[PDB]
């Protein structure tokens, strides 16, 4: 599943990232660097037409759903490249199948100014000359790996072979589903940027801190990532909505209630939520009818607009 | 091609639009409506690795390239839908093929509070089943046309009949490939929103109006629409770059462009359209020519793609 040979190398990265977690500075720095670069900060939208169904509170939807073809992947990558740069690494590697992660990796590296090399499967190479094209346009040595299978796994290995050799100057950039996810806390932390961005936006758009910041808890981290920046704001309730069918407060939301919110959001604002987001919404509206006129609530709309259209359409 | 029966209804929309064109009211209303909604305001990005290469001017990129392939269909549809509401229409109809125009149109109606009807070929309805479900989740009514041989052509024709009969309260939303485009001015004007956005964003990010705003002029209205909002800002230069009313035109050669192309990829990791690359080349000379601390706003119009090949060949 992972060579043992990766252990000292992974241990190096974790220990180095552990030093970053002491302050907000790493995160702050990432947020600076990615500002207006590829999608970040995702928009905060005041859903004025939901207001009437939420006790006339002001519902603000943190729009993590506005991500598709591009925005997305650069986010993980840029975090990593920044870490590589602060570990005094000078060079970055990765594997990619079809080429999307190699392009993101190559992107983060031109941006931050770091040599970069990408490992592509032999017959993967000659069936997208284009991403290769992007990658070489981005300045990245593409090593088209001939040796056995031809279909990713052999590239993972050279990439692995590389990383152990060169570990003093090289960072491995992870992001393919078929590759290793060795640093799960580092991934979680990158999610806190949602709340960091949403805390600036809600005070600029709403003129203060919110009454509440709300997320569906089955989105995992990334739904929950909106909370961290509001932990020291004693006036701000943090409410995680649990899917039920039939410091943080946790509250249940049934299938029906999610479903009805899903449809109201499509009809009131023209936005088609993930069933995940519709629970956070359904709770946001109950919470506004609780809190009344003049309340301000922030909702993490996490998960994918498309996915659930089928299930929603059956349901109705 | 276009039925003559349509002349009066087209004539009413053009007349009413020409009266909106008078002031920035209509556009300020679109701007407000769509803020944070589906992509607009596109970001304004300070390209600080490029400064080295431009007299140490500051180059800001107006990131039209961050559009989704798709971001543009709701943008145009929201404009038409807000105009229907501002004219007093209560209802908006359209035809759709595979469903995208229908989904865009229903999304704009749900947003603005308007009744929606979409006419689809009876067959198109069966094949594009989840575009239909999106439409109805959106609250639109979807008519699977049973007339003729249940074709797109037959759909359009039912939609033209409903338009004519219900013109007092009903607006027709254009922008399928098989449909007409009776209002090119309207569509060109919507592009003015680019410079209105960028005029706000350059004062927050840079603290003042810029020294120039720049765009590549082969890129049509999508290029040239950044200029309008700064027209009355004497002190802001307006430069249009072309592949060699107060706007200045200058030529940019193929190899000035391709050097700007490779420079943007390599310094910023942004792969531009060749079209963006000409404006980016022009902005690099102009910073050399205005020098240190000069704020130059560049329209990055067109799509960072299909020029990829052509850029690869070149290099």
| CB distance B22 to B51 below 8 Å | no
Residue A302, C-beta contacts closer than 8 angstroms, at least 6 positions apart: A64, A65, A215, A216, A219, A222, A223, A226, A274, A276, A277, A280
Residue A304, C-beta contacts closer than 8 angstroms, at least 6 positions apart: A65, A274
Cα–Cα separations (whole angstroms), residue B295 to B47, B55, B58, B121, B195: 11, 11, 5, 52, 15
Distance of CA B109 to the CA centre of its chain: 19
Distance of CA A232 to the CA centre of its chain: 23
**Which residue is associated with the tokens 């307006």?**
B238
* Contact pairs from chain A to chain B, CB under 8 Å: 102
| CB distance B243 to B218 below 8 Å | yes
For B58-108, give the DSSP string.
EEEEE-GGG--TTTTHHHHHHHHHHHHHHTT--EEEEEESSSHHHHHHHHH
Residue A46 token pair: 């005041």
The answer to whether A51 is a known catalytic residue is no
In chain A, which ranges are continuous DSSP H helix? Answer: 7-20, 25-33, 71-86, 100-112, 122-125, 129-137, 153-166, 184-190, 193-206, 255-269, 275-291, 309-315
CB neighbourhood size of A21 (10 A): 12
Q: Which fold has domain B1-40+69-191?
A: Rossmann fold (3.40.50)
| CB distance B90 to B115 below 8 Å | yes
Report the distance separating Cα A201 and Cα B111, nearest Å.
22
Q: Which residues of A touch B133 (CB under 8 A)?
A: 309-310, 312-313
Give the sheet arrangement for strand B91-96, strand by strand: B141-145, B115-121, B91-96, B170-172
For B13-36, give the DSSP string.
HHHHHHHHHTSTHHHHHHHHHTTT
For A16-51, give the DSSP string.
HHHHHTTSSHHHHHHHHHTTTTSS-SPPEEE-TTTG
Report the distance separating Cα B296 and Cα A194, nearest Å.
30
> Do B130 and A36 count as a contact with CB atoms less than 8 A apart?
no
Q: Is A126 helix (H, G, I), strand (E, B) or coil?
A: coil
Q: Which of A20, A64, A95, A257 is catalytic?
A: A95
| CB distance B169 to B84 below 8 Å | no
Report the distance separating Cα B315 and Cα B311, nearest Å.
6
Q: How was this structure determined?
A: X-ray
CA dihedral B249, B252, B258, B259 (to 10 degrees): -100
Q: Is A99 left (phi over 0), alpha (psi -120 to 50) or beta?
A: left
**According to CATH, what is the number of the domain A41-68+192-316?**
3.40.50.1100
Query: So where are chain A's domains?
Result: 1-40+69-191, 41-68+192-316
- Return the bridge partners of A144, or none: A120
Nearest to B192, CA basis, from B279, B44, B93, B79: B79
Helix (H) / strand (E) element for B109: namely helix B100-112
Residue A112 token pair: 């931050």
Phi, psi of B241 (to 5 degrees): -100, 130
Residues present in chain A in total? 316
Report the distance separating Cα A43 and Cα A129, nearest Å.
35
Rg (CA), chain B: 22
Q: Which residues of B touch A308 (CB under 8 A)?
A: none
Nearest to A61, CA basis, from A228, A218, A274: A274
Report the distance separating Cα A195 and Cα A227, nearest Å.
6
Residue A227 token pair: 């909370």
Q: Which residues of A touch B136 (CB under 8 A)?
A: 313, 316
CA dihedral A294, A295, A296, A297 (to 10 degrees): -150
How many CA within 13 A on the CB side of residue A94? 30
Rg (CA), chain A: 22
Indicate the resolution in Å.
Answer: 2.2
| CB distance A202 to A236 below 8 Å | no
CB neighbourhood size of A98 (10 A): 15
Report the distance separating Cα B280 and Cα B63, nearest Å.
12
Report the distance separating Cα A44 and Cα A62, nearest Å.
4
Q: What is the CATH class of B41-68+192-315?
A: alpha beta
| CB distance B173 to B105 below 8 Å | yes
Residues of A85-96 as b/e, b for ≥16 C-beta within 10 angstroms? bebebebbbbbb
Residue B247, C-beta contacts closer than 8 angstroms, at least 6 positions apart: B227, B238, B239, B240
| CB distance B296 to B58 below 8 Å | yes
| CB distance B201 to B188 below 8 Å | no
CB neighbourhood size of B244 (10 A): 12
* Chain A, nearest residue to B60 by Cα: A36
Helix (H) / strand (E) element for B268: namely helix B254-268
**Which residue is associated with the tokens 């359904």?**
A282
Report the distance separating Cα A270 and Cα B77, nearest Å.
13
The answer to whether B197 is a known catalytic residue is no
> Which residues of A lie inside 8 Å of B (Cβ-Cβ)?
35-39, 43-46, 49, 63, 66, 68-71, 106-111, 113, 129-130, 133-134, 136-139, 262-263, 266-272, 309-310, 312-313, 316
Residue A207 token pair: 């003129």
């Amino acid at each position: 599943y992972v060579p043992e040979a990766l252990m000292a190398v992974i241990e190096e990265v974790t220990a180095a990232y552990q030093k970053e977690r002491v302050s907000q500075d790493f995160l702050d720095d990432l947020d600076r660097l990615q500002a207006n670069y590829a999608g970040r900060p995702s928009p905060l939208y005041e859903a004025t037409r939901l207001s009437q169904h939420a006790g006339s509170a002001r519902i603000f939807l943190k729009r993590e759903d506005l991500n598709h073809t591009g925005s997305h992947k650069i986010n993980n990558v840029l975090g990593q490249a920044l870490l590589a740069r602060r570990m005094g690494k000078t060079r970055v590697i990765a594997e990619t199948g079809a080429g999307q992660h190699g392009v993101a990796t190559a992107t983060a590296c031109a941006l931050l100014g770091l040599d970069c090399v990408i490992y592509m499967g032999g017959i993967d190479t000659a069936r997208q000359a284009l991403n290769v094209a992007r990658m070489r346009l981005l300045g990245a040595e593409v090593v088209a790996v001939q040796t056995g299978s031809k279909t990713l796994k052999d590239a993972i290995n050279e990439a692995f072979r590389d990383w152990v050799a060169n570990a003093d100057n090289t960072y491995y950039c992870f992001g393919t589903a078929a590759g290793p996810h060795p640093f799960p806390t580092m991934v979680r932390d990158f999610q806190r940027i949602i709340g960091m961005e949403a805390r600036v936006q809600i005070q600029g758009q709403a003129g203060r801190l919110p009454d509440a910041v709300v997320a569906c808890v089955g989105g995992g981290s990334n739904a929950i990532g909106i909370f961290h920046a509001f932990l020291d704001d004693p006036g701000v309730r943090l409410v995680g909505f649990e899917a039920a069918g039939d410091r943080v407060d946790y509250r249940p939301i049934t299938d029906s209630e999610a479903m009805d919110a899903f449809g109201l959001l499509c009809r009131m604002e023209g936005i088609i939520p993930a069933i995940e987001s519709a629970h956070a919404v359904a709770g946001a509206l109950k919470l506004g009818v609780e809190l009344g006129r003049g309340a301000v609530i922030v909702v993490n709309l996490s998960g994918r607009g498309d996915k659930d259209v089928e299930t929603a359409a059956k349901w109705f």
